[PDB]
Design a protein around this ligand. Structure first.
Ligand SMILES: [Zn+2]
Ligand SMILES: [Zn+2]
Ligand SMILES: [Zn+2]
Ligand SMILES: [Zn+2]
Ligand SMILES: [Zn+2]
Lengths: 336, 337
């Protein structure tokens, strides 16, 4: 088998200062004991990358490689040339959270792009075998790199549905036209809730999404005063929490994924007098990641185009375009 | 030959006439509608919603109003004359989607006794539908059976919460509040198989009263500071209690919110998110929960249910004064019409 016994450099987009991304040479990673070297084909930009880029992220400082939405090809060893998409969350397998099958809550949970783990905004990453899912030949690595953002919302929806105190699952309202919102919308339709409305103020993304949206797309005003069995706040501001509160039917589900900001917004009185199940969600179980990949690859989660690509060398420029709010697509995929 | 009230004069009721004004006066006897019973009230508990209305804080409860919704008593007239009953005060339609779903506590046209248009049970008599009445066996005092409604509130929350949890880890529970809603949560948790229950109450007089018959741990907030529990129950429902329940809930655990203190913040939203806490606000009880509560009360699964002191209805105004002045060691006063 071909090996990397000696290494040189690889290209990476490194976060060097607030709103500053430099495309430069960094050392190629050394795989640990039971780890594979992944040549990154596609790595998507996430709300956590944006948050760390604007200097808002407390835990992600200094020089740092961001990005945790990676798909690519194993280099060297008996799985050389194998096409895989990466689960970036590494879990201890032995804490109470893991043993009940809620590894998303592991006490020592690490993600790629979260020190001490470098991010996937680079030509190569080192990853344990158990964090890799094989991508069939008929699925582009560019669609497979959506595994992680889809898996966040898939986890929310599965856990939410299973947590509901009744079987009345007719209506869902997803708040936010970002990647989280779309993932929630397509997860809700794949998991058997057909009547899904996504609500988004931005006319541009409404048109983008309406291309191949199997679910209803609307503006806040077209759903004013309506109530739904299920609400998904994919944005997570006070305003969006307030909106989700008002739009959840009595006995209904309010899923809170987005991490916008604020410590309020929930109508405590409505949630008590109308008995609303409110569930905050974090990432996904390893089994959710695998289920998500399975549902993508067999076509249950729609066309998965809601993407535009850019070279890693143009990463910085791509961040500016999201900031200025001029990306019609809800996801930018970088190409090392 | 069944006894009847074909003619009626007045009865005694304790009437909310204005802010902090309770007037023990003559009011009309209620005339039961078609499929309803007249109940002569033996025992009626004072709730937080009564004190809220008495202080002028309730927009839905102005004018002259008879408060109270925690009643037990005797059927008067007809074939059930003399039957001891405890009253489910929440009247539900039985045919709306919530009712058909089995969640009749969320009935779209739900009415509760003490919320207009339905007069409360702070009176010698109430009129209630037969489906809202649970028979009390002679070995259960009406003073203990009048706890059914406040115990059904927490029993319902506990059952809903346990059923809704995302994992089968129910080892430990914190109850915040040594009021009736808190004591009811602690006993309901133990009867539903969470053995390890800690109730937290800052007031020493209340803790001491609760220690008479506590099968759960009674403690100060400081004695549990920094600990996390599978299950937290906010039986108070201020911002401070919502914060304390947020902090004390373990990742993936359950935070039940029952209290109606006030405020619309306190919940640590970013921890509920990052640590995936299931947060459930709860309202009253299903008709089935109320029946289930009564059954467990009557067979002794919910402890001695002796955590009450009683006052004649004629002294209701003094009783309200005592509660307001933090003068009441017991977590429940039962008024005696
Ligand atoms: Zn992501
Ligand atoms: Zn673990
Ligand atoms: Zn009550
Ligand atoms: Zn109904
Ligand atoms: Zn007194």
């Amino acid at each position: 088998h071909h090996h990397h016994h000696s290494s040189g450099g690889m290209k990476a987009l490194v976060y060097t200062g607030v709103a500053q991304l430099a495309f430069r040479d960094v050392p190629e990673p050394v795989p640990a004991a039971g780890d594979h070297l992944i040549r990154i084909d596609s790595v998507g930009i996430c709300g956590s990358d944006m948050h760390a880029y604007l200097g808002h992220d407390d835990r992600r400082p200094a020089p740092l490689i961001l990005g945790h939405e990676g798909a690519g090809v194993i280099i060297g060893g008996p799985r050389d040339g194998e096409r895989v998409t990466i689960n970036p969350l590494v879990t201890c397998g032995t804490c109470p959270a893991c043993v009940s099958g809620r590894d998303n809550l592991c006490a020592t949970r690490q993600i790629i792009s979260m020190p001490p783990r470098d991010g996937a905004f680079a030509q190569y990453v080192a990853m344990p075998a158990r964090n890799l899912v094989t991508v069939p030949d008929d699925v582009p690595l560019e669609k497979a790199a959506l595994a992680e953002p889809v898996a966040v919302s898939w986890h929310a929806v599965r856990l939410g549905l299973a947590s509901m105190a009744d079987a009345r699952r007719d209506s869902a309202l997803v708040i936010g036209g970002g990647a989280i919102g779309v993932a929630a919308a397509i997860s809700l339709q794949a998991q058997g809730v057909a009547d899904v409305t996504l609500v988004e103020p931005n006319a541009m993304r409404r048109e983008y999404l309406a291309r191949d949206a199997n679910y209803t797309i609307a503006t806040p005003e077209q759903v004013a005063g309506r109530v739904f069995d299920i609400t998904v706040d994919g944005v997570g501001y006070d305003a969006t929490r307030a909106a989700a509160s008002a739009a959840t039917r009595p006995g209904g589900l309010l899923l809170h994924i987005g991490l916008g900001g604020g410590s309020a917004g929930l109508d405590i009185r409505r949630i008590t007098l109308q008995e609303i199940t409110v569930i905050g969600t974090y990432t996904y179980t390893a089994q959710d990641f695998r289920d998500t990949c399975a549902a993508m690859f067999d076509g249950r989660l729609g066309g998965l185009d809601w993407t535009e690509s850019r070279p890693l060398s143009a990463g910085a420029d791509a961040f500016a375009d999201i900031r200025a709010g001029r990306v019609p697509a809800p996801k930018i995929i970088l190409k090392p």
